[PDB]
């Protein structure tokens, strides 16, 4: 399969960046209502946010 690795030429750019050799994605589901309020406990965090 075609390795689609694209080389980085500028060190001042961020490591994860939308390099515009990649073609642009064209833009445009059972979403529940906000009234059935689900609440997380306060110590719940996303992983590795620090």
């Amino acid at each position: 399969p075609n390795v689609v690795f694209i080389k980085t030429e500028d060190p001042d750019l961020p490591a994860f960046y939308f390099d515009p050799l990649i073609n642009p994605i064209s833009h445009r589901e059972p979403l529940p209502d906000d009234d059935e309020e689900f609440e997380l406990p306060e110590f719940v965090e996303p992983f590795l946010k620090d």
Partner: protein, 75 residues
């Protein structure tokens, strides 16, 4: 007035941004025509959708993968 009929294959070619013109060059001699050329969203590759005579499709994949340095692939 009886006539004959031959089978036509559908061809999709996955190629980089410059080899597409080489694909147009290769398909020019096997009595084919390119119907669709579409960029893949979220990827730097293109898709070429075409028809070819099946009697002309002998060695077609080897022609593409030799003329395009093995980069383009076709089914």
């Amino acid at each position: 007035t009886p006539r004959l009929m031959e089978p036509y294959y559908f061809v999709e070619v996955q190629a980089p941004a410059d080899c597409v013109s080489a694909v147009y060059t290769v398909l020019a001699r096997r009595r084919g025509h390119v119907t669709q050329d579409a960029p893949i969203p979220g990827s730097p590759l293109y898709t070429i959708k075409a028809f070819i005579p099946a009697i002309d499709s002998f060695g077609f994949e080897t022609d593409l993968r030799t003329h395009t340095q093995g980069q383009a692939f076709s089914l």
